[PDB]
Symmetry: C2
Subunit: 52 residues, 2 copies
Amino acid sequence: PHLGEGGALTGTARKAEEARLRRAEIERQTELGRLQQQIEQRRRRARAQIEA
Amino acid sequence: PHLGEGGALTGTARKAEEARLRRAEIERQTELGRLQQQIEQRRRRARAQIEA
C-alpha cells in the first residue's frame, strides 16, 4: 500500500516521490548538523579564551 | 649614640635627618602599596572576564 501524502502517485512517480523525500530529509539533517557545529565553534572560542 | 650614615650630624640636624628618613621610607612603602593595588586591578579584570 502507498504510504505518505499524495498517495495518488503510482509507477515511476512513486519512486520519484520517495527519492525527493529522501533528499529533503537528508538536507534537513545537514541543516541541524551545521547548527550543532556552529555551537561547537562558539564553545571552543569561549573556553580557549578562559584558558588564556 | 648616633646611628645611621652621616653620624657627624648633631643637634637640630639629627632631628631633621630622622624626619627626612621617615618621609622617604614612608613614600617607598607607598610605592610598593600602589604596585600591589595595580596588580589587584589586573587580577580583578582577569577573573571578571573569566566569569563572563
